Design a protein around this nucleic acid. Sequence first.
DNA 1: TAGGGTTAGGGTTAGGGTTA
Lengths: 121, 419, 431, 82
Amino acid sequence: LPKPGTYYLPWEVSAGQVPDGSTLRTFGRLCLYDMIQSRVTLMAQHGSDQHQVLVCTKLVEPFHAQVGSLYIVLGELQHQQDRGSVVKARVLTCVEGMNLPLLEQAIREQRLYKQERGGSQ
Amino acid sequence: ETFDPTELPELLKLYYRRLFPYSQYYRWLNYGGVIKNYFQHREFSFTLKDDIYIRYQSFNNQSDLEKEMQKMNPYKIDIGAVYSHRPNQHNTVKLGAFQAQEKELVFDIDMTDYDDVRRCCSSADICPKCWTLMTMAIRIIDRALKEDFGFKHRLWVYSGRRGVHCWVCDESVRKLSSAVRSGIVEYLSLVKGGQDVKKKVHLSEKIHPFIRKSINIIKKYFEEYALVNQDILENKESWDKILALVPETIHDELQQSFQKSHNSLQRWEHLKKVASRYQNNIKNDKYGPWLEWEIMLQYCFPRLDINVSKGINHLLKSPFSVHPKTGRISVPIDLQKVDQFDPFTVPTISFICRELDAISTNEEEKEENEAESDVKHRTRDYKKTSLAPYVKVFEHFLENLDKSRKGELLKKSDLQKDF
Amino acid sequence: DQRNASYPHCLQFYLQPPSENISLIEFENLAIDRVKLLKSVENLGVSYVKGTEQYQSKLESELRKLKFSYRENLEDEYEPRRRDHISHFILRLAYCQSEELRRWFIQQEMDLLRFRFSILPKDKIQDFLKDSQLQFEAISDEEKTLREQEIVASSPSLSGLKLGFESIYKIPFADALDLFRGRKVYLEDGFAYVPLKDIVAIILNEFRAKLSKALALTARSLPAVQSDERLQPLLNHLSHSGNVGKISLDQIDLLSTKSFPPCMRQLHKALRENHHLRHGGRMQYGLFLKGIGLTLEQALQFWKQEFIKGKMDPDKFDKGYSYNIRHSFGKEGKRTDYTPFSCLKIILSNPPSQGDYHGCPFRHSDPELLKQKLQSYKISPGGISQILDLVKGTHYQVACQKYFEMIHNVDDCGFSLNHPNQFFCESQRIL
Amino acid sequence: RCEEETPSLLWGLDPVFLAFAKLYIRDILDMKESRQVPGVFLYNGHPIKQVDVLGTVIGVRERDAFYSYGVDDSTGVINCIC
DNA sequence: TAGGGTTAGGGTTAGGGTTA
């Protein structure tokens, strides 16, 4: 059995605020599909800032690509020497039309409740 | 003392607790961690009591491996191939994307595959006289690998009962496909044919350099062993089955010569003379001009099995195992002292356990009041045992591999202009 | 100068996908024409032998009929070269579904390339290599003379020290597998010293196979985006498109004496004699009995009986043998149900060794033992001679057909033999 | 003090006993059992007999007569039997 | 003389440790 997948907004993982080898699930919008090297570069906006996450895909071929669309990625993170941070994909589904603010508020509320229950112990 | 199957499990637990060389074993498997998680993606297959078969047992780290080995206490240890994902989570990835990637090239030699030729023992029995068979087989295969292909690192392991295994562990070989390994095994195989076939060699006038080298390095051993020890040409039925290997044109003459002769030496000399006479008098014969050479190869060459090397996900016994029939621990065989390797002198599990008891007896008055961890205690434990030469040979091989890694990284530094 | 730049030579490794635009009907025509040509060349290759004159002449006639590029007249080769290029990449897009399909495509393309290179002049082969992205190395006459004896005793079809006026190339071992396997080239510390013609042909073939394999692997991930409604019928068209009733457990002996083909009669006889068999024969026999209408329970009883006759222990049987048999039929475990081995696969399977009996006797048995076993089956001397002639001609399937006709007293079988299930079902139809 | 579980004779008075409760998977992993009646579990004074989970499947295994499924709900993983 | 019919109902159990 594997470890569970905790949610993480793109900008935190972009800054490397998670330990190496952790399992995380995040979101973003695809920007490029490097065919030969099996690499995916998705992007997510934050005000005037744009953040990039590198996704290895060696475990989900065959895989259709939808340029300029949202995605959900779940897997493990490995801190490479030069490439930086890349997530090893285990499941990679596509969702469209789902509004970000509801999701962001949802994880914020869940984190708040978890911390509140953590105040008794 | 005689090994009994009713006393093994406690000795096995003690061995796994104290003497198993975990440090060197991990050092070999880890390969220095040049590739991320190379050791972490290995497949293991234990075999617990009551002959229950399990497999796909990865290990996160050396300490976890030690703890699981101590808890589980399995019988046989095996090594698989390196995959793209952790084997213990093989059901967590889509089917078809979990494929074997690299494994070490191996060969196997079965002593029992020579029953129709050998006569020293019967079935599953061994004698010191027949050990020359696998000795010369080892020499032939090792020389061929060292010279023809130039593979650097080799490690020979005696299975424990009747076999010896080859563990080629070089760098540019682990990445080979299945077809290349099949080609290797085909090129290294000469004894061809099933049960229905009698003659195992069909050689033309031309002789390959490999065959020439084999026949040159095989003469110095064929004479003594074959003529004196086994005495192939002793009885009537012996040469009766011998003559099936030669054309019928001289069958009666050779039978009469054998009847006249008294010992196998005279019969072999007369066979040589008759063969030499026929070579000078070759007249429309499809047979090769090397009757003596082909019969020596037929009754003397080793036999491999393509199935154990063609597969890439196949399994084979790991070294330092414990055979459940004789208790002899599988140990490496020195390359420079192959001719001085008696199979019956290899230490057994019961003898090594009594040695451990005597070691504790000595420790009762030699080593006292030591506040060391289990690492140093087990280090001195397997130092004081009879396995010291074997672990020393293993360490020397590991040092050779480490020196090769140092050379390859220095070459990479020279190429990359990083000094 | 698009026309000349696109197509400089009649041969091409097919490394540059085109960029022009084609009508749909022409697309379909090219696809069907090249698949027809490939099937025809496969059949011609499997019927005759390589080289000669009739086989190559018929292949050239097929190429000329199907308006492709086969010769090298220096005029008006734009159209055939373009058509070959387009159709080859279309089939590259097509045959990327299963590993066996990829292997078949690679083999047929290899055959076609070998033919075209075999009709290529030497100056032209040198120019074609120059345009290719390949590097070769030439050793010096010093070591050429130093290693004369090995290179002449390797017998690469060499005729008594003909190395005068020759250039010897040094190649790593992992690229010359064809000459590597047959023991026709001297070897030294992972290197090969070789004559000119055979090794250049084989090296080109092997590198082409590797590069085509890599490109097919790359293209495998494309059909995920091939959701176009058009071309779907064409892809479906190119995508290609033994259940007899239950039998008893005591008629097997009579059916074996009646219905077992030679490729398995020896295995049955050995099983009935020694009551014990090794892996290679065991899986083959189990698959065959599964494929002719034997249930799980009937097969378990049969195996337990024939192994009790072998002096075992029932507990040991349950632990090992019935345990293996359960997954042999896909009862538990991965349960991937296995189809029986084909006649071609069995003939080209692992060669049996001592203590093994699997494999058709027409390929892995002595001629004298084969004749004796045929005489044990009461085969006419004329039939014996015909079987021997067919064996000499390596036509094992025709020999099996003759054996079927002799045992069943039918003048003509009327069906081509490809699988033991076919043999058994036809025998049951006769019965 | 030794926390005494509520006596089994008063479990049914709760309205939750017969219902399908919704829980975090970490909670169902880390929440304790009851000694007097094995097979049922006790959480914060509310006995629980039935649960309902939802998430993404990340593990599939087949057997002779029962499937296997590893579900994930962003906080933990549990096996399923069908 | 004011609601219909009023009825209590599903409430068990199933097995890992496997390859061509």
